[PDB]
């Protein structure tokens, strides 16, 4: 098994489908990564995550370095052994949560729930045993000004080189893991270009598009993807961080994105929102109290084979943990079925038709 | 498959082991019934409940009549179909929660979260599709006086006859379900006797011992069981309601009890308490933060095959739903392994030795 091999099997327009082969397994692209912030995909055993079709999950450097601790996880055998997921794990670098959750120099950032630098982030991700390591970046809030966008971007590019060097200095990491760079530059075409050029000069295994899904709206996000994804190396995976709703994912694939992560299916499942091919529904609504149909009429997941809307409605209204478990399994399974339909339609040269058919029914 | 057939395969002293055959399956005795108050055994899929070894679960008339409603559950196909458990279900009658949770004549009780009578309780349990129906009783708080104990007991005996008649008037219920009477009389030998005599004159499929596990302490509970269980028909199952801790169960079996239910393994599992053969542990304690051993070194459950104390410690301290799921599966599996060891040791004529060996290690 190779360290990291991305192969594009089929294209349609800007959309691609294929595989990333890694030592712990194969990732089918376009891929959706369930988020496992605190070494768990919330309310699911790892076997259940796998059963839904997930090939890879996401963990977070910031959360795990605080609880339970990166050195502690390494002493316990690594994140895979710790949480019981033996397939690839991508770890975000911590740059976003340092900004978004905690309370800043060229060397790095100090904060209160600790210090984080490019070199420390890579070391933490090494200690976790991450398969796809993200470069450590400096994030700026939305809506950023041109000055704050450029200044965050250029520092992020200097930090990308430092991340690259720290990764390459760790023999075990360099031989067994992969490293992705993060393109910044907010909604400004020029800065996105300067960012892409700098990352391509350094050379990474994959290229993430950062700085989106922070409140910009789908139109603007698509506008930025329109010019930003062509700037990235075509022969490497393209990862859109933090995205997103099902229609966001379809449109991002139409624009060249290969990888996705977001908390929406897990978080909104626990809140009562279930995704269906006819759009989301809120299972708490009184109209479901005696609905014997499954959450979705076509879904193949174990929840839709076994339980009714009426039962899940009862569980969520009662605050029952099984409600959260079932909603989450169905939502993650729905997302994986979406990615499967995207992959098959690109492979078959009918993704354009699938996207139109998906949107017409989903927004009917 | 028979409606209800209790067969004692082996005895040792007052202890018995055997089977209850019912239309939806066989119940191995002594049996522990996981509690599924709101049509779910908290944080477990029914398949997981079955995987732990449970033959039967407990539901509650009081909770389900309020949410989601007994007529509604019947319209949706019954409790078994609703929650996805196709094996026997025993429903408590609601008499305890009417007292313990809500805010009283010879006819029945009116309360605020509705009315409950012997006839209405049996009808609700019919609507739920319960396999073992409990007679509706009038409970009195602990510590009851001799006057309040006798008055509650005698009314409960009149209500037991009314429960019997309502059950027998419902042909589908009488042909497919079983009916248990509840012995009351608090800690008073004379009243326990009068209660036992009245129930035996009416005739029931099984006999529950009510009015215990309400704060009386194990010594007093055992003292009451010492004279109360011999009063019940020997050839019928003996159900101790609401009990209990593992040592409570062993001592109750030594005194003739065949069936048990309690929220302890589920509720205290979510609170961080895990049962082991060396006694309970609280997994939140800092001493488990780097403990790679399973919750219990001998346990056969899926949790102890896959995850460490250290990981479960992290989950429970983080408030993660998977923490509750794993603790609960292990605790219910531990209880079922206890019942299995009890059944095997009685069958083999070494239960006395097992009880001594269990207590010496569990309280070491
Ligand atoms: N550049 C990073 N290290 N992280 C990152 C980037 C874009 C994101 N968008 C959201 N949305 C919520 N979360 C994100 C995290
Ligand atoms: N007689 C009934 N219908 N119910 C009943 C009886 C004894 C119990 N003890 C506890 N302990 C908490 N719960 C119990 C429920
Ligand atoms: Zn489903
Ligand atoms: Zn176990």
Curated annotation (Swiss-Prot), chains A, B:
Entry protein name: Queuine tRNA-ribosyltransferase
Swiss-Prot/TrEMBL cofactor(s): Zn(2+)
EC number: 2.4.2.29
Any GO molecular function: tRNA-guanosine(34) queuine transglycosylase activity
Protein family according to the UniProt entry: Belongs to the queuine tRNA-ribosyltransferase family.
Keyword Zinc included in the entry's annotation: yes
Listed HAMAP family: Q_tRNA_Tgt (MF_00168)
Bound cofactor: record note: Binds 1 zinc ion per subunit.
Effect of residue 137 to A: Abolishes catalytic activity
Region span, RNA binding: 242-248, 266-270
GO cellular component entries: cytosol
Active-site residues, as the UniProt record annotates them: 92, 261
Pathways involved: tRNA modification; tRNA-queuosine biosynthesis
Binding site for Zn(2+): 299, 301, 304, 330
Family annotation (Gene3D superfamilies): Queuine tRNA-ribosyltransferase-like
Function as written in the Swiss-Prot or TrEMBL entry: Catalyzes the base-exchange of a guanine (G) residue with the queuine precursor 7-aminomethyl-7-deazaguanine (PreQ1) at position 34 (anticodon wobble position) in tRNAs with GU(N) anticodons (tRNA-Asp, -Asn, -His and -Tyr). Catalysis occurs through a double-displacement mechanism. The nucleophile active site attacks the C1' of nucleotide 34 to detach the guanine base from the RNA, forming a covalent enzyme-RNA intermediate. The proton acceptor active site deprotonates the incoming PreQ1, allowing a nucleophilic attack on the C1' of the ribose to form the product.
Pfam families linked: TGT
Superkingdom in the source lineage: Bacteria
Keywords assigned by UniProt, alphabetized: Glycosyltransferase, Metal-binding, Queuosine biosynthesis, Transferase, tRNA processing, Zinc
Top-level enzyme category: transferase
Encoding gene, per UniProt annotation: tgt
Reaction catalysis annotation: 7-aminomethyl-7-carbaguanine + guanosine(34) in tRNA = 7-aminomethyl-7-carbaguanosine(34) in tRNA + guanine
């Amino acid at each position: 098994r190779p360290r990291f091999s991305f192969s594009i099997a089929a294209r349609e327009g800007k959309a691609r489908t294929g595989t990333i082969e890694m030592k712990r397994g194969v990732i089918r692209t376009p891929a959706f990564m369930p988020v496992g912030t605190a070494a768990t995909v919330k309310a699911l055993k790892p076997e259940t995550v796998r059963a839904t079709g997930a090939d890879i999950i996401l963990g977070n450097t910031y959360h795990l370095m605080l609880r339970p601790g990166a050195e502690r996880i390494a002493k316990l055998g690594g994140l895979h052994s710790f949480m019981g997921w033996d397939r690839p794990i991508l770890t975000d670098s911590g740059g976003y949560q340092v900004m978004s959750l905690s309370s800043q120099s060229e060397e790095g950032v100090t904060f209160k729930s600790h210090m984080l630098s490019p070199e420390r982030s890579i070391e933490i991700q090494h200690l976790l045993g991450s398969d796809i390591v993200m470069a450590f970046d400096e994030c700026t809030p939305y809506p950023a000004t041109p000055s704050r966008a450029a200044s965050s971007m250029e520092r992020s590019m200097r930090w990308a080189k430092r991340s690259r060097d720290a990764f390459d200095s760790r023999k075990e990491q360099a031989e067994n893991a992969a490293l992705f760079g993060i393109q910044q530059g907010s909604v400004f075409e020029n800065l996105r270009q300067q960012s892409a050029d700098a990352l391509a000069e350094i050379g990474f295994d994959g290229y993430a598009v950062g700085g989106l899904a922070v409140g910009e709206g789908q139109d603007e996000m698509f506008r930025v993807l329109d010019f930003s994804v062509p700037m990235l190396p075509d022969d490497k995976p393209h990862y859109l961080m933090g995205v997103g709703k099902p229609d966001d994912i379809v449109g991002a694939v139409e624009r060249g994105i290969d990888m996705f992560d977001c908390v929406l299916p897990t978080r909104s499942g626990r809140n009562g929102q279930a995704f269906t091919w006819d759009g989301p529904i809120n299972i708490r609504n009184a109209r479901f109290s005696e609905d014997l149909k499954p959450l979705d009429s076509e879904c193949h997941c174990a929840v839709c084979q076994k339980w009714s809307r009426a039962y899940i409605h009862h569980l969520i209204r009662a605050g029952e943990i099984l409600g959260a478990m079932l909603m989450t399994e169905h939502n993650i399974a729905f997302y994986q079925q979406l990615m499967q339909k995207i992959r098959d339609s690109i492979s078959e040269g009918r993704f354009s038709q699938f996207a139109q058919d998906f949107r017409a029914r989903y927004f009917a």
